[PDB]
Design a protein around this ligand. Structure first.
Ligand SMILES: COc1ccc([C@@H]2C(C#N)=C(N)OC3=C2C(=O)C[C@@H](c2cccc4ccccc24)C3)cc1
Ligand SMILES: COc1ccc([C@@H]2C(C#N)=C(N)OC3=C2C(=O)C[C@@H](c2cccc4ccccc24)C3)cc1
Ligand SMILES: COc1ccc([C@@H]2C(C#N)=C(N)OC3=C2C(=O)C[C@@H](c2cccc4ccccc24)C3)cc1
Ligand SMILES: [Ba+2]
Ligand SMILES: [Ba+2]
Ligand SMILES: [Ba+2]
Ligand SMILES: [Ba+2]
Ligand SMILES: [Ba+2]
Ligand SMILES: [Ba+2]
Ligand SMILES: [Rb+]
Ligand SMILES: [Rb+]
Ligand SMILES: [Rb+]
Lengths: 391, 391, 391
């Protein structure tokens, strides 16, 4: 009984998945038009709006205070520690992806690299808050430029750190805002159980597929906790238990950015991790992490090759696509088109994967959110001395 | 002579209506193309831009400071007092509308209720400042989402109230901004006489109509002041005299939001009403008040029924349309289309009402602005003890 | 050797022009599609994004602190001193333009004056940060409304000045932001040499022309320094030497707004000019200065007259076009269409000038930036007593 009283929301979100699968399977014979399905998935559609609302005033305030709270020289070194994790776990994921297709075996290319660079330095910051760039033959398309806001908030936040006296007012300003936008997220958390059940129920009512989920669950729950135990020497599945209210949301939302306001709450509260490092690792992680998506795209790129050397060129192109899709609508659907041009394979295969990606996209995010959460834990232990200096 | 010296602007705006009708009737034979009429109505078209400019930094700052200045528990109870007024005066207005058609007698329906809920929780706050949602088969259409900004500013303002120490800096920030955006409104007030005369003169040069204005003037100047005298026990037409510089602007602007920066000045200055309650009742009132529009739409919905039980379904649909039209262009023209689908009557009748609505829209706002102004007065008297606690 | 150590960036930007002309002429035979030329001009295309990013949080913060730091009554008088320079140098430029065509001799008109007034008072401030108005038969077109933001920031900044106590927090806020957005500009300055060489090299690879450059260099380097020596009595080409890192950028960027963040740094650092006057003269100057463009448009308007009284009507129309083009894409290309309607000459001549304007546009900005820089110097000397009062 004492477990039900403490972990009330945790069990309710678990109940939401159970009831969500039940309600979906109960209302599986569909005599209703897809127009009506959209009307049904509405109590979960509202949760998405509330979460996406909070993305921007969280991402901007997180990194502005994050880089200013952290010492000017220490910021640079702590970042190397984050990139050490971000590049290592990405190499293992793309390596695991080639292993899975070996034993089992079941817009332009150049423009994606240019558009990514075009977004790193935004032309306008007001536009950046709801518009991203991707050249077409308007090139500024709908959907937040989270890459441009993260990059600007890094240097802007750092500029305030090196400003000290004059810079103190604005850091106090974004810390107040980060705390306010986190007080709003404690409320949106209570709508989540009602949301999740109406969100996953709507999405169900519409061997290669298994290949991804097989390697996905082993990289997530075996490779990553082994990286935590190797560096921190602490129990990883106790840490994973803390971020459960964040992991369940990830399995429904499918967006690391939309789940970031909850990922922030779950890590700060349940796991007890320092805000300065969560504001540093988490926003960047939920935007440039390749672990989850690289493993999903690796099997997705060698699948059409079976129907039909230079493996290094396939991985780099699959990386420039996902970082290029920060908050872009139908992200995995449009990015997989460019990777097929680099390998020279038809786009006829995509029309089949879309019908099953809806569930696969939920799983790739669950690994990405675990990668960012564990990434923070690994960073804190490897930088415990740098935080002692500030106190 | 002493009246001319004190009430200089008040008489100038009165003179603007007189000269506006004269200039319009003097330049009534129109050999000029509607392109040229737009060029003539320009010195009043600028006033609209200046007022609409000020809407957003007023609405956001008003409710942020409003909910933070007011005590956390008292905010909830004071709101019940506002909703008591907002739901009672709306019931009387829709009741008076059915009475007027009894003696005299002269996008989907479901989507309007969904889009309203879709706007209450905005997906992005930067977009919300100039874009509203209304699904079409881009669904985000031009025009400020005043509903989404009011709702966000309520919870955000409240979050700062419950933040105290850290939250003090941001409340001091939006109070400075509210005072600054009010110092700009004292200036825009002097352009108003020159504006009003060129605005109403341009709009003229282009039994059922009388039915609305008959009940409109009796609900406004008879029903509402009786609600003031019943609760406050104070003289209502002395209060109405204070908000005259606001009532005249309403008769030209036709938008409660565009007139709100002046409605704020008229109530704070001439009537001497506490800023904490004006920042609480007025922004919400100038967005969710149904009094004026419900009385206009009630006669507009039973008029086509004469050409041709379930009266409850007509009223709720007419409510979801006007709240859905916060700052939407050609508001009364597009909303009246949905109400005809619920009753099952043709849209052929709208092509006739548009030619006379231009003057009828000015009258419905005049009652709505009086409803929000008197609403504040009724709220202050019913919550004088809650404000004493803060001092 | 001591000159290379101090003026490192100054010589690098000089080297960028030299190497930029060399690389362009080396890669002059073009077997590559214009699609590939765009890909080549990319390391300079990024510099433009970084600069344009900084325009808005510089322009808004500059004038907000500028009008608040300066005394309420002194602001009005110091402005007359700026307009004295802005109207005199414009009269001389349009006079010099008629002289050049005398010896050598080698949307509606009304709507441009209406749209300019429509932009001075913006309808929305969020939209103003990335959208300008210009009626077409959406009228709000892409590109920052720098006119509307300058005008709003003037009155808003002044409102804070007249607010004192409450207003102190927000002025401290925009001064922190101006200092932060200037700390970002010191970094973007180091990318400029790499940018300029890839920017001008790409633009090359694609008697009347000489007529503009002849009068342009004599008004810039002869007329303007004579205005400095007549008022300040100080050496002008020592001042011009200080703003060299700004003049070189102007010869590549072609936009006074995009070069303003560097024009600000060059004047504050190298020349040692007071921030209060740079925040006052420079943003306004880089938006309403007609010197450079009026001289270019004067020769451009009387050139087609040769192919084919009321000279006063041609000058005023050429003024309403350039102020109307603050941050509008293909500015000189669309504005020259309206001036031809007022004189009654065909638009067949524009198709030829576009092929050479790319270099002529770079020269007109170089004079405009020199006009704003020298304008500040002339203003400081004519208002040295007004700044002593504040200290
Ligand atoms: C492209 O995707 C990214 C962006 C950032 C990062 C690292 C990170 C994380 N996680 C965070 N929070 O800050 C910094 C990082 C650095 O490498 C460098 C570090 C830094 C230190 C000192 C001065 C800087 C100035 C500008 C930008 C970063 C700076 C900040 C990694 C990948
Ligand atoms: C949909 O249209 C509306 C929105 C608001 C209101 C009321 C109102 C007015 N007028 C204002 N200024 O504040 C609050 C109101 C409440 O009912 C509730 C009250 C409140 C109290 C305590 C905590 C809150 C937390 C979130 C939102 C409102 C809260 C605030 C009425 C209708
Ligand atoms: C249309 O293009 C422009 C806008 C501005 C200016 C002048 C200027 C410059 N440069 C700056 N920085 O401030 C002021 C100017 C005034 O003439 C007037 C001055 C001023 C003084 C006192 C109160 C004011 C209130 C509102 C606006 C300006 C005010 C400010 C000139 C042309
Ligand atoms: Ba990674
Ligand atoms: Ba410090
Ligand atoms: Ba009401
Ligand atoms: Ba308090
Ligand atoms: Ba000038
Ligand atoms: Ba002072
Ligand atoms: Rb996703
Ligand atoms: Rb209206
Ligand atoms: Rb230009």
């Amino acid at each position: 009984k004492s477990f039900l009283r403490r972990n009330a929301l945790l069990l309710l979100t678990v109940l939401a998945v159970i009831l969500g699968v039940v309600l979906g399977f109960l209302l599986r014979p569909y005599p209703l038009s897809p127009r009506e399905v959209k009307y049904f998935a509405f109590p979960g559609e509202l949760l998405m709006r509330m979460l996406k609302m909070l993305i921007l005033p969280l991402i901007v305030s997180s990194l502005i205070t994050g880089l200013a709270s952290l010492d000017a020289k220490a910021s640079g070194r702590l970042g190397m520690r984050a990139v050490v994790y971000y590049m290592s776990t990405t190499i293992i994921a793309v390596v695991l992806g080639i292993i899975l297709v070996l034993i089992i075996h079941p817009k332009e290319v150049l423009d994606c690299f240019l558009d990514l660079a075009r977004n790193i330095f935004p032309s306008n910051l007001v536009s950046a808050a709801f518009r991203s760039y991707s050249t077409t033959y308007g090139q500024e398309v709908e959907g937040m430029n989270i890459l441009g806001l993260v990059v600007f908030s890094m240097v802007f936040g750092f500029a305030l750190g090196k400003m000290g006296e004059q810079g103190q007012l604005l850091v106090d300003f974004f810390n107040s805002l980060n705390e306010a936008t986190m007080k709003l997220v404690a409320i949106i958390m209570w709508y989540a159980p009602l949301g999740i059940l109406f969100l996953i129920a709507g999405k169900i009512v519409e061997m290669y597929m298994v290949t991804v989920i097989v390697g996905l669950v082993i990289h997530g729950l075996i490779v990553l906790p082994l990286i935590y135990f190797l560096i921190t020497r602490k129990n990883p599945f106790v840490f994973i238990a803390g971020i459960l209210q964040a992991l369940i949301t990830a399995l429904g939302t499918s967006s690391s950015s939309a789940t970031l306001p909850i990922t922030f709450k779950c890590l700060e509260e349940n796991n007890g991790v320092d805000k300065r490092i969560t504001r540093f690792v988490l926003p960047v992680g939920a935007t440039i992490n390749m672990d989850g998506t690289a493993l999903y795209e690796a099997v997705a790129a060698i699948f059409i090759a079976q129907v039909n050397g230079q493996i290094i060129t396939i991985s780099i192109t699959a990386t420039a696509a996902s970082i290029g899709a920060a908050g872009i609508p139908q992200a995995g659907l449009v990015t997989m088109v460019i990777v097929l041009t680099a390998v020279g394979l038809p786009t006829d295969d995509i029309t089949l994967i879309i019908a099953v990606d809806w569930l696969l996209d939920r799983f790739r995010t669950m690994v990405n959110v675990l990668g960012d959460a564990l990434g923070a834990g690994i960073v804190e232990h490897l930088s415990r001395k740098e935080l002692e200096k500030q106190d």
